[PDB]
Design a protein around this ligand. Sequence first.
Ligand SMILES: *[C@@H]1O[C@H](CO)[C@@H](O[C@@H]2O[C@H](CO)[C@@H](O[C@@H]3O[C@H](CO)[C@@H](O)[C@H](O)[C@@H]3O)[C@H](O)[C@H]2NC(C)=O)[C@H](O)[C@H]1NC(C)=O
Ligand SMILES: C[N+]1(C)CCO[C@@](O)(c2ccc(-c3ccc([C@@]4(O)C[N+](C)(C)CCO4)cc3)cc2)C1
Length: 515
Amino acid sequence: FHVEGLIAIIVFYLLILLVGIWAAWRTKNSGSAEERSEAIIVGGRDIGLLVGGFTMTATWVGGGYINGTAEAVYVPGYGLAWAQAPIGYSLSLILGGLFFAKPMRSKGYVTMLDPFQQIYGKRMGGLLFIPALMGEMFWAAAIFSALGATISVIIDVDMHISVIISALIATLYTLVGGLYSVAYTDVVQLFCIFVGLWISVPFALSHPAVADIGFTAVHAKYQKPWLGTVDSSEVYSWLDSFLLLMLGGIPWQAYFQRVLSSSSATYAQVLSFLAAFGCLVMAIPAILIGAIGASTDWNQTAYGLPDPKTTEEADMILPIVLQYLCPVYISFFGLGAVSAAVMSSADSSILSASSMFARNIYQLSFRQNASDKEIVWVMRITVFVFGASATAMALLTKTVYGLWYLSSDLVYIVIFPQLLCVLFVKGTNTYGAVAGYVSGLFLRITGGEPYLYLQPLIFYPGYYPDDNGIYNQKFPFKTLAMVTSFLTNICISYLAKYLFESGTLPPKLDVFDAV
Ligand SMILES: *[C@@H]1O[C@H](CO)[C@@H](O[C@@H]2O[C@H](CO)[C@@H](O[C@@H]3O[C@H](CO)[C@@H](O)[C@H](O)[C@@H]3O)[C@H](O)[C@H]2NC(C)=O)[C@H](O)[C@H]1NC(C)=O
Ligand SMILES: C[N+]1(C)CCO[C@@](O)(c2ccc(-c3ccc([C@@]4(O)C[N+](C)(C)CCO4)cc3)cc2)C1
């Protein structure tokens, strides 16, 4: 109901949009003359270390990660040792920039699936494009729903209007400016989230009511000592989640698009390392906010005796702290920081998915004669369509976090093993890749999603028949699936690639090219 909140938010939006358009105008005429087909997707192959590092740091830290870290820190049963998102992201980026992204940039690509369409073919590229698009779209939709909840609670305005205007801003961004605008707006929002998060903490910390975390950490508190141990019963599950965050974060058109624009491979790996450092340094505010929220005495605050953890409203602790433990003019800063992180992740995801589609699907499946113009038209139209679909998914999907998680498992199981095979383990043909993708899909689908009821059927040891009926299992069931898929891929690919010249084995038939 605060009229000045609308003023501040719209001023922020208009200013940063002006920055994005001012960035796009200069590089309107950039790259080669006939580079209109690929200027958007490639970024001119010339960005600095600073810009790329800031962009990647803003891309991974997109608000949803902040909320997840706060939840893992705050919710009882969880703990700081259960907040594997920051550490997972940091070591994922370090491993990426150290091992991968050297040969991905040294040769010179445009999208992720370039090795896929080079070694398997267009037929496999058009089938492997789906998981990345689905994952990016559901991630963006979940982050949008988070933004809507934050707005609808911090300000009295409804979530629909704010979500739709933010989506309109992102669509204008990825229409007008290809990659330079996204990068410069990423640096703007990264600074914004840094300053907002690190200015909203001390005011809440020194509240007269909340007990100091210097003691509210070890002995006995209202919620729980927020450290959080790993149960001897379940250490596999934590291993599985940690592995998923380490490895499933590597294959992503966001990071791959950022590395595919560095001026040189060395600058690309330094970009990845600096992005990891930035994620590490931006982790701390989320942990501090979680500690602040966990140490409160909610009865004597303005929220009331029913704690958020006791009202099933704990899914959004950070806005509660922002709007209750801090005054109005710092609550606005915190809300702006959250919105900026959301926009960074949203624009990165939309640009990545639309780039992948508009290049790889369109050029290599439908049209190659329209070499320059219709390609840029396809990118802009696809960006707009994906923005509209993001609006629809954010608006009318009650269960979107489950879709986000399911797409994360799908990517981490099907994309990473094939990417690793085509990069480091040569000799694999399309037969083994097809079989491994099929096996991974079967293992994921028949294993049963915890948040819906497609088919939760497995005799997996340690399956837990909880109250809602989702007999989920505590054994990893995800890393074992991915390792089985990768091993099956490599083994049968090698067996076929040798068997094709043995006997009546493939003397005549060739389902796909093998010689
Ligand atoms: C949660 O916080 C509330 C404060 O909003 C606590 O209420 C407080 O309760 C005590 C105990 O009754 C009140 O002290 C005395 O209350 C009587 C009425 O029963 C009154 O006639 C006396 O003059 C004296 O105030 C105290 O006033 C009250 N707080 C306020 C602000 O009025 C509540 O006890 C807390 N929950 C728990 C479990 O302690
Ligand atoms: C306890 N909950 C609330 C329910 C699910 O388990 C959690 O601990 C949780 C939260 C987030 C994730 C998560 C998984 C994948 C991804 C992602 O798609 C995001 N990126 C694409 C940004 C990189 C990593 O892959 C992000 C977050 C996984 C588990 C959070």
